[PDB]
Amino acid sequence: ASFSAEYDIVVVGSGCAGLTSALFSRWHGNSVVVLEKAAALGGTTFKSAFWYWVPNNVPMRAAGIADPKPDFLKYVARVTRPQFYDPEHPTLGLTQWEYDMCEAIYDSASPAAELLAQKGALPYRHVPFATDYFSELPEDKAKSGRVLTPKDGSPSMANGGQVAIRTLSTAARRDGIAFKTGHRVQRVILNSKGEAIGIEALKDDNSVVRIRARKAVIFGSGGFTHDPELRSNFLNVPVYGGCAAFTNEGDLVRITSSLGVQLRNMNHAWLCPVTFEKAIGRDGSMSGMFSVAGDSMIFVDKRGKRVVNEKLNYNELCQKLFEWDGAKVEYPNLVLISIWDQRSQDHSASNDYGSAIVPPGADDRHVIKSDTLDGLSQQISLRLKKYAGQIGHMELSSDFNANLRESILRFNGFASTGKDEDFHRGERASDVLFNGSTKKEPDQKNPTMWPISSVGPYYAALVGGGTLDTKGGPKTNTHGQILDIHDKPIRGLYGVGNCVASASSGAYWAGGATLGPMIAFAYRAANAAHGEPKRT
Template sequence: MATNHDRSDSRLSRRSLLAGAGLAAAAATIPAEAHAAPARAWDQMADIVCVGSGAAACSAAVTAAAAGAKVIVIEKMPFLGGTTGKSGGVVWICNHFGLRAQGIRDEKADAMAYMCRFSFPQVYDPTSPTLGLTEADYRLIEAFYDHGHEAIDHLQAVDAARFKQFRLWGVDEPAPDYADHLPENKVPTGRALEPATGAGGQGGGSLAMQLTDWLERHKVPILTETRVTRLVMDGGRAVGVEAEANGKTIRIGARKAVIFGTGGYAHNLDLVGLHQTALYGSCAMPGSTGDFISIAGAAGAAMGTLDGAWRTQVLFEEALENRELGVCAFFLPGDSMLLLNKYGRRVVNEKRCYNDRTRVHFAYDPVRDEYPNQLLFMLFDQRSL
């Protein structure tokens, strides 16, 4: 779709969303106190500017527009949806409408213990008021418990997206959690939701389509092939952005807030080399180049840890051909496959979830001074092939 910079009407084309194109965007908000932006040469003006077009940015855009704000969405790629568009579209939410309808009590204390234990096993302490976490990390997880289900309810109430309980491979039972075996997990199945339509492996495309369709119906301008390059600051506040489009610089003002939901940096080799021990490829969309890191840093924002990721294993041969992978090794046939390291030793439970399996690759052997599991070999039979 050609980039549309018409001030009067920059409507989203349905064709611009590629159906086969996770919920993997990283979002950050800049202070949103409503002060009028100082007079300056803006090419366009809105209350809220949302950067990115995946689930993070588009859900923010829907929420703001539904509350009556004038919103502009900016996407640097020629199509919409980001990595969300090629993900499974599964969202993991405590105490959601489906659990409540089933009479399942997803108690806050239990859910908090599970989330803190699984997210921060190195510091988890059940006797601590913050379960061993820093105050900031604990409050972030608490906010997720308190408001995650409210966000889902709101998206459904404004008819922006519809959800149902996630079913894995068509099995007529709610999918289990990744760590359903932990004793802190009192609701080990049923928290995962997927789009009510278009699920079954392509749920992310459905989720992205639902959100962008809603924006189209409500005439929210969306600019594609427009790369945000800089925050415009005034007195410590973000009052707009500068962006590059068609070889020109445009300025878009924001009366209330600039919201970034622009994904990670998996395809920025400089940042990968700086922050990752090893990253051979990624199924993130090619636009995941970490633009927000330099933009926020230039505005004076301090970065948190940048070496984390929600990971999966990749086939090395495929990554050598193209590090922008269509799909990765999310599920392995654990009954008929072994993962062996360079010494022929089995080093991981093949049935563990993909993110947990990847951690074994980073085990360091201080005697041999090497990472013996950095590359693993898949041993399997004809049935698995």
């Protein structure tokens, strides 16, 4: 029973979690390999803007923006476990584990960011204007300032992930880390003491390779969005997919099923609305709809009524789509219809951040069009019929047309006063902050709303619920060590990123709140793995 290759540390996956874990490991003097399931490096990280939320970061301190630790913990506790949050409780109402993980994020994200930049692997610039998603909470004492992004990201920052994967992987090759693509890890090999001593991977040609790890196996294999069975059986909502890399199929869940782990936070994903047709069609370029485009634009349900603030934070807005009507045995908002006019088409269109409104040249198969409102509803009906088998054979109400006219009349009044009496669109900072581009109007009272045109053409797109990726898996301690059911480390076995349980439950603290913590844990995991004895 022997191995065709041997390294000190074997890393699984080449997104943020894998690359950073590998670099930190290598810089301690270990030999390292990165095993990537796909043909290309980068996973979901590659598609991201690579905002990374780093509490008490060096640029903030240089700018004179304070980030006190007790207040950091209160902010995250209040957002993460609202029912239990208590400022007088010794762990703010969090479990000891959740509290310890949040503390580790605060302690380790900045040194991790600093080392990656110092070595030239992830040079950054500060994004001082990027504001926390629940900045209005009094617990938040550093409402803006925590976000970094790759130094050479574009001005929109939309290509940040591509830049990060380039800088990280360039530094990895420079520093002698080995890479194997088309290697799907499928097993952890144990010694007789039950310690991880290597992996088995399936190659594209269907050969199996065994690779030894002298000190540690570190998983950075991403989530399970694109295993439909796992997704449907674990998540708290029945999402249609998400912007995760399609190779993120929850392999670690199968890999650990015989290792005695504790699967934790399996009920939660990072959530976001998606352009429904791109989810169903498996458009690999799809982004979550982080900014819902248009000011002269509303969402309506199948009755032709507004049901939600369209500018609400994406992780929260997605949840509205899965409200349950128990009397009718249906999801009334399963798909919502975004409706906009020529003004929003011309001035709110974007290639970035999952906008449904796209400029000339962009893929617009998901866009529904008509010269009149009555014509639009007939076009929407055809689209619903096309996807009937995915959406409970949903149909527009027989009163749709008249309801939509009433909805627009009401909205147009709100747009003129600047006050949305129904859903408070534009009243929270995050509504304005992620509003997207608009035609700036001299006398606009609220930047998130402008009256919808009294003439066509009119445009629409179906909006459904998806993920960025999942955030449940084997529980680790704060050093990235995968625990057995008695809360003790399985020696040699580590996990970082979306493949292990996040301490953020169902919450999404700020932009960059996936990547920032992840880099902290890669640093802590690599530092602990470096201290393993060489084994078997």
